């Protein structure tokens, strides 16, 4: 067992893409058995998203085409 | 005044451990793609190159 | 090929939430200082000792 | 939504094996700061903020 655990202890499906200033996609590894989608909000609040194509492939658009 | 001035596509997807997508803002006209390699090394990816497209898919666990 | 081409000192240590110190390597002749502000923005910092020292002491103390 | 990345720290590490160090400020995610070092192979470990070791690794990292 390593020093690290998943940063995401829970997730949220309640988010309007416009509120997000940053999205980090972290691949699974020794630190976490699952992938993680960490979104940062305008205000500096960070949340984790569930891995469904909707939200993310959508949020990525709002950020990638801005 | 972006952090990602000089980009690259000279990256082996299998070496990317994470990808941060940053929205264009007051200090950068365009969105930025910052990838981290296992080495810990951080590089910027080309928003116009097709690489990051399949890169993000690999991290999602193929 | 460094990620940090142009660096800056125009930052408020009070708004930095994380600092990534990257060792100089085969792809970058010098160390690289990457700070993350609360709003998510990322910037490269000048290597000026007094700067990162003031920044690390603050992050490592809240 | 977030918690501490570090659940424990290691002390048996060669300062010259560290290619990267991440200094994370305490906040809602973790009530304590954290020191995450990546190693030459890509392995990540956390460092004790009490021990003087990390201060050594930092200065050794910045001076190239």
Short mmCIF file of C-alpha atoms in Angstrom, two decimals, chain A residues 11-59:
data_model
loop_
_atom_site.label_atom_id
_atom_site.label_comp_id
_atom_site.label_asym_id
_atom_site.label_seq_id
_atom_site.Cartn_x
_atom_site.Cartn_y
_atom_site.Cartn_z
CA UNK A 11 -18.78 13.17 -6.68
CA UNK A 12 -21.43 15.56 -8.01
CA UNK A 13 -23.67 15.61 -11.09
CA UNK A 14 -24.92 19.13 -10.33
CA UNK A 15 -22.76 21.56 -12.35
CA UNK A 16 -23.23 24.07 -15.13
CA UNK A 17 -20.21 23.86 -17.52
CA UNK A 18 -19.91 27.66 -17.53
CA UNK A 19 -18.87 27.66 -13.85
CA UNK A 20 -15.76 25.57 -14.55
CA UNK A 21 -12.35 27.18 -15.07
CA UNK A 22 -10.38 23.91 -15.02
CA UNK A 23 -10.86 20.14 -15.46
CA UNK A 24 -8.20 17.59 -14.58
CA UNK A 25 -8.45 14.03 -15.82
CA UNK A 26 -6.44 11.64 -13.68
CA UNK A 27 -5.87 8.08 -14.92
CA UNK A 28 -6.08 5.14 -12.55
CA UNK A 29 -2.89 3.88 -10.97
CA UNK A 30 -1.35 2.88 -7.57
CA UNK A 31 -2.87 6.04 -6.12
CA UNK A 32 -6.45 5.29 -7.14
CA UNK A 33 -8.26 2.24 -8.68
CA UNK A 34 -10.56 4.52 -10.67
CA UNK A 35 -10.15 7.47 -13.02
CA UNK A 36 -10.98 10.90 -11.60
CA UNK A 37 -12.46 14.08 -13.07
CA UNK A 38 -11.59 17.07 -10.92
CA UNK A 39 -13.27 20.31 -11.91
CA UNK A 40 -12.29 23.69 -10.54
CA UNK A 41 -14.90 26.43 -10.32
CA UNK A 42 -14.58 30.18 -10.97
CA UNK A 43 -14.61 30.68 -7.19
CA UNK A 44 -11.86 28.16 -6.48
CA UNK A 45 -14.08 25.32 -5.34
CA UNK A 46 -13.08 21.88 -6.63
CA UNK A 47 -15.52 19.04 -7.27
CA UNK A 48 -15.31 15.54 -8.74
CA UNK A 49 -17.58 14.34 -11.52
CA UNK A 50 -19.07 10.94 -12.28
CA UNK A 51 -17.45 9.42 -15.38
CA UNK A 52 -20.40 9.65 -17.80
CA UNK A 53 -19.73 10.92 -21.35
CA UNK A 54 -22.46 13.62 -21.10
CA UNK A 55 -21.09 15.98 -18.45
CA UNK A 56 -17.41 15.67 -19.35
CA UNK A 57 -17.38 15.39 -23.15
CA UNK A 58 -19.62 18.43 -22.74
CA UNK A 59 -17.54 20.35 -20.21
#
